[PDB]
């Protein structure tokens, strides 16, 4: 990773593809955001786990 994702925008993008509780179409829809802007991978990072908690089995 380095022309598009640098660092931290490619671990928040792992982050979001290996959240457990977060479903499909939340996680694609947030990792098609993501590729489409690394930048503001921390809020979408954010918003997913946020998304992955609400959802987490209780």
């Known amino acids: 990773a380095d022309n598009k994702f640098n660092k931290e925008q490619q ?3 792992y ?3 290996h959240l457990p509780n977060l479903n499909e179409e939340q996680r694609n829809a947030f990792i098609q955001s993501l590729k ?3 930048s503001q ?3 979408l990072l954010a ?3 946020a998304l992955n908690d609400a959802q987490a089995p209780k």
Do not use: R, T
Request: proline content about 7%; overall charge negative.
């Open 47 to 49: 918003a997913a786990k």
């Open 41 to 43: 991978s921390a809020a």
């Open 36 to 38: 489409d802007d690394p």
């Open 11 to 13: 671990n928040a993008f």
């Open 15 to 17: 982050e979001i593809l």
